[PDB]
Every structure is written in structure tokens, then in C-alpha cells.
């Protein structure tokens, strides 16, 4: 009866955008797998924080399906996600089974690379807007969190808490999200 | 001409309260050392995120002095900090040379354990207030960030961004903090 989340961690990922959703989701009782794109080895993030993944993406792929697939941001991390065929397969499969896909900051540009969710309303970091909008395949929003169908996007490191709580609300409902939120001492 | 920050990382630390200040401080051009309390080995944080420290505390101790010493929270992490003689020595030395000491959430309870900054106004997570106030050695504040002399404290995971930017402002000034803040997409 336990919901399950896959967080894909690549070199150059924004470490705040990785750790906040992982932390918050586990506070919500979600079983989270931090999967290394390149393997089980430690991942150097964009600001040189080094995180040990729970598993390789290859192994995590075999233990699906996941209720949410989470793509952190970071410019170089998002580029690595955009170039990976394994990520394409995971995302297309998630789209087909109508599972939730969540991406933050530069992360959403990987959806464009893999032709995921065309026609959806999405947001990105302001610096990633032009890249995301190449071709006009999505409609752009400036909301701090945006959810359209099964696509949930957010803008930046400072929206990470709202991004993570939106995932919790989508998976576990509004009451659990409110319960998890109170001990965090968030402003709003 | 480069400011230097020491972040002490112990098992059970709150990983969000560790990564956010490290990330933000490096964005500000501060040279940050994440030092493992127990050694160079990977540290399992309170929500099972595993972080590889830059160095052992023993080695980082020899490469001082630091313009700021940062104590993350997490109940079990703060207890480990409170029990460590090496932390006591580092903090007493920092207090003597009038360097900045910064602690968040449960982290400030380590200041009480080591008799640091008595007489200062401090804040904690609400759940750590009674522990911090044992003996009436400090004056309690409910401000999200509190700075009294060389003691800078903050309340919880959701205050981590304000906590980190206060460090940047104290070290590098208000203009650098504002410059670092804008790309984060913080609400206020």
C-alpha cells in the first residue's frame, strides 16, 4: 500500500533540488529510490556536494513501476538526462501508464528532448524558458508550481519545498501534505 | 581574500539543513569544507540521504581558522555534535577569536552542551526550545533567523534559505547576498 518514487540523479544535478524532494517525500512515508544515471557510484552535484545513490538506474528500472518519476534540475544534470536513452524509456513508459512525472528548474527541458507531454502547460527556471519553448510544443506558465495532467513542473531551487509538497499531495492527499509541512517551519 | 566556512556533518544530521547552506555559500564564492565528524567516510543523514564529506573533522581542524562554523540540525545529529569533544574545542576557539557560529533547528542545542555564547538571544525549532532553555542561559526568540553578536541561529528546514543567506550577508555583505538570491526563485 506504499507509494514509490524514482529520483534520477546525474552529474551536475542541483543538489538542493535533489535532497529537498527526497527528504520531504520520505517524511510523507513514500518509498524513494535515488537512482544514479551512470551507476551506483557517488554523484558529484553542481555545487560539489557528493551524494551516494541508493541504486543504479539500471537496477531501479527493473523494480518498477513508480507512482512518480522525479527529474531534478541543474543545467549539466538536465543535459545528461536529456541525452540518456534509459531516461527516454523510463519516461515514455511512465507517460503510457499515466504515472506522474515531476521536473524542476532545468529538469523540464529533458521532457522536450524525449518528446514527453507535448501540449501540456509547464514552467521552468526563467533562464531555461527559451530552451523549453523551442518549437512551441508546450504552453509556458510563470507559476511557482504548475500541474497539467500528469506533468508537474516547478521553477527553481527556492520552489523546491512547494514542488515536493505538490508531489506529496498528488500521491498521498492534501491532509498528509499539510501534516508533513507543519514541522518544517515554512513561511507560507 | 576568500572567506572560508566549516560545516560539521554527523550521522543523523538533517540533510536539507546541510546541503542548502553548503550550496548557497559556494554560490557566494565562499570556500566550504564539509567535514565528517567521524571521519572521511560517507554520512547517513536523518532521511537516509548519504553524503560524502570533503574531509574528516580532524584534518579540517588543522586547516583553520574559519570565518564561520556551521552546525546543521537533525535531532540525532545535534546529539552527536553535543557529545563530541572535538566540536567543543572548535567552538570554544571560534568564540575566542570572535568568529561567526551558525546553527539551525536542533543544532543550537550543541551550543548549550559546550557552554557557547551564554547570554545571547537565540532561536531553535519549537520542539527544541525546552532543551535549549534548560537553565535560562539564553534568551529565546521566535524570529525565523536570529543574530546576536557572533551567534546566528535559525528554526527549521524551511528557514534554511534565509539562514544561509544571513551567513552570506554577514561574511560577504548585503549586495553579494542579493545577487546570489535572485537566481534561486525565492518567494521573499
UniProtKB/Swiss-Prot annotation, chains A, B:
Consequence recorded when altering residue 9 to P: In PARK7; uncertain significance
Predominant location category: membrane
CDD domains attached to this UniProt entry: GATase1_DJ-1
Effect of residue 17 to Q: Strongly decreases enzymatic activity
Effect of mutating residue 17 to A: Strongly decreases enzymatic activity. Almost abolishes detoxification activity on methylglyocal-adducted CoA
NCBIfam families assigned: not_thiJ
Chain's role: Multifunctional protein with controversial molecular function which plays an important role in cell protection against oxidative stress and cell death acting as oxidative stress sensor and redox-sensitive chaperone and protease. It is involved in neuroprotective mechanisms like the stabilization of NFE2L2 and PINK1 proteins, male fertility as a positive regulator of androgen signaling pathway as well as cell growth and transformation through, for instance, the modulation of NF-kappa-B signaling pathway.
Disease: Parkinson disease 7: A neurodegenerative disorder characterized by resting tremor, postural tremor, bradykinesia, muscular rigidity, anxiety and psychotic episodes. PARK7 has onset before 40 years, slow progression and initial good response to levodopa. Some patients may show traits reminiscent of amyotrophic lateral sclerosis-parkinsonism/dementia complex (Guam disease).
Full protein name: Parkinson disease protein 7
Species of the source: Homo sapiens (Human)
Amino acid at each position: 500500500a506504499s507509494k514509490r518514487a524514482l529520483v534520477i540523479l546525474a552529474k551536475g544535478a542541483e543538489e538542493m533540488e535533489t535532497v529537498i524532494p527526497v527528504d520531504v517525500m520520505r517524511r510523507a512515508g513514500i518509498k524513494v529510490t535515488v537512482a544514479g544515471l551512470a551507476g551506483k557510484d557517488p554523484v558529484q552535484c553542481s555545487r560539489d556536494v557528493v551524494i551516494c545513490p541508493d541504486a543504479s538506474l539500471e537496477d531501479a528500472k527493473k523494480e518498477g513501476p513508480y507512482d512518480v518519476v522525479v527529474l531534478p534540475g541543474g543545467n549539466l544534470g538536465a543535459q545528461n538526462l536529456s541525452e540518456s536513452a534509459a531516461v527516454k524509456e523510463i519516461l515514455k513508459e511512465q507517460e503510457n501508464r499515466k504515472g506522474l512525472i515531476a521536473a524542476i528548474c532545468a529538469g523540464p527541458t529533458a521532457l522536450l528532448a524525449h518528446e514527453i507531454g507535448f501540449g501540456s502547460k509547464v514552467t521552468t527556471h526563467p533562464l531555461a524558458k527559451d530552451k523549453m519553448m523551442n518549437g512551441g510544443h508546450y504552453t509556458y506558465s510563470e507559476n511557482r508550481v504548475e500541474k497539467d495532467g500528469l506533468i508537474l513542473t516547478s521553477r527553481g531551487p527556492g520552489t523546491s519545498f512547494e514542488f515536493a509538497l505538490a508531489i506529496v499531495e498528488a500521491l498521498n492527499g492534501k491532509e498528509v501534505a499539510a501534516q508533513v509541512k507543519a514541522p518544517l517551519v515554512l513561511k507560507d
